Amino acid sequence: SEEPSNVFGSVLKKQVEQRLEFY
């Protein structure tokens, strides 16, 4: 991606933190 989307970065970190909460 020439201009990456921090919205996708943030929702990816959100799913990661959802898994961390699932721990």
Next chain:
Amino acid sequence: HIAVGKQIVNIPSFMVRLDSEKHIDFAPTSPFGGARPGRVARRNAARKAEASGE
């Protein structure tokens, strides 16, 4: 242990057609793709049940 279409064949040189090679499947009487296990399995189960009940 494998029937072609519906027909059981024990000849390895059948020279099948295309529909039939799609229709290769185990025999429903075979212990593998169908009916009860063979004499060896059932006699070993018989001797094993006999030994466990003994």
Next chain:
Amino acid sequence: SDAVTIRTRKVISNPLLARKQFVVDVLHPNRANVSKDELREKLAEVYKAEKDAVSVFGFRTQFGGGK
């Protein structure tokens, strides 16, 4: 499990012979070689007829069995 299904084909009445001719096709899966007496019984019931007037003959189980 096993269901003897007795089916017919090519049924023609011969009123000259005052009868009906038909090719009998038996399916006896998980089964082998049902007896012609029982076949005549079931056929007489199916055709509302009498077993003595019913006659079956010339039967051949396929390779393997079940039919």
Next chain:
Amino acid sequence: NPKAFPLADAALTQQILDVVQQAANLRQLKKGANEATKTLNRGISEFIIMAADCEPIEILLHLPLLCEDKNVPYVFVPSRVALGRACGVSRPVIAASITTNDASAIKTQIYAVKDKIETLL
């Protein structure tokens, strides 16, 4: 010219998804983008099917680069739901890989679509 390079028409897409089911039946197709990258590294992927409707196109656009590196052609499907349905699985796969096996009765079919795919590229 978008980044969505070769994407077949309806009939071509239909027929590759049919080789997809037959190779999944004969266990000649592997599943997943990371696994497709793995068999690319392995040198046994014979060609690649990818999606177009993923989140986003880039995580599967990483694959055509290694495809041109290891001379293993590739194409795109419009629907990854359709790709997972031809994979035969409840979840929508976005990338699947046709492998190599010499004793495969569908190899003439795969070499046929190989001709058609190379003429598309």
Next chain:
Amino acid sequence: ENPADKRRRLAKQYLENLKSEANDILTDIIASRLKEDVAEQQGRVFRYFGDKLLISEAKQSFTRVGENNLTCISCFQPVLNKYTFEESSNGDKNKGRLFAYTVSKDLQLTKYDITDFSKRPKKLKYAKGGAKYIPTSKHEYENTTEGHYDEILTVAASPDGKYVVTGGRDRKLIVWSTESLSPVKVIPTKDRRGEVLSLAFRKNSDQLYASCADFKIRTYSINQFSQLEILYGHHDIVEDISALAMERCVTVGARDRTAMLWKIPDETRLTFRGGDEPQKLLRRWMKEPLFFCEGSIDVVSMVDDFHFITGSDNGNICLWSLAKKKPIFTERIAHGILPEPSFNDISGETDEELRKRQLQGKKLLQPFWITSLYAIPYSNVFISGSWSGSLKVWKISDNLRSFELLGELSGAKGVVTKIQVVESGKHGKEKFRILASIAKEHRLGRWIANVSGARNGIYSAVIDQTG
């Protein structure tokens, strides 16, 4: 005291009712009603209510249920017999209680009363499986666990009103009583890949045909609890099934894209294939847009002794006769194309022009799959349904060469799984209840999870006829 006298007495009451109904419609025709009974016993398409319907006032009612991922539903409608004259229902306290039997991926079968067309379907009883019906051997022909243990998929009520059969991904066919929901029998498929796909009772008979996932179909005897026949010939999975009063059984396989019309009387079968070419369709249009090739045919309803309709996945709806190998009337995109996805989700890059370039315009549009498709028996109308939330009813012409859209219904939301029609009333007036078990996911695989406002439940559409 004599049975012939009792039959004649029932016939006397029958003709008395016939003449009083004739006087009612008056405020020839009796023999016409007799011929209608004979056409019901066997006939072609005769129910011609394709114009009396009032679709704009069709009352809609969605019913959300607690159970998730509904797979199938089976309506039992008891009808009065023609040869005998008691009922088709078994008990006396039933007296024609309209029944529904829903199976859902939570391993749950639930019976409902739908005897009224204004109220809501009442959850009469239920039965749920679980992991305690997990079998101990896991490697034998024995799969006689009294409950289901994995992914029930299809249900079929027997026409006698005595039994209900259930099949699913645990390769079993458990038939139960319809009152206590007690497992009266269970038939294992004796297979590794013999998973139950779709069931078909022969109309007015216990002859149940089971389309199964091991490329074969099993026909059963229910009263004796056995497997009569198995038929082979499907190159892909035997995906859906349909049956009628005689010994024909149509089955669709998806990826060979084939319609098998199995003939029980011969043990044999007939074939049907499509084959619409987009280049020929486009050249014909140039002689006159998009043209979606057939990916998979998935649903059939056998509408007659000589005709059947098939919904495919690429939007096609093909009507077929027994005379021609070709579809006698193909149909283009039914529920429309799927809405195009979003630019930001398809690209993930702040360049909006590149985002719409990745949207690519026309080359990423896909149609709606006709998920469910049900025909009213021996009628001239049929209904189709997708995850558009738009249940689309059409009618076939009298010459049986085309069908035209009657209307759409928007009370359902999501992937409609199973449709059934229940007719009620007197001979003149007929109220029709269109019930549809509807979930958020497809019954076979998930393949999708984001449908806006898709609910697990049943949508009921009650319509009248007038003309």
Next chain:
RNA sequence: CAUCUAUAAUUUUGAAUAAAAAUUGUGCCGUUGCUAUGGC
């Protein structure tokens, strides 16, 4: 399946509690009125 009985309805006596004849739409939360509708 039939009968029988439990629950729910009338009858009579008692202002009424009371007594007996005798008969015969949700797994979870939410908006939300007199049921419809969100999301997991």
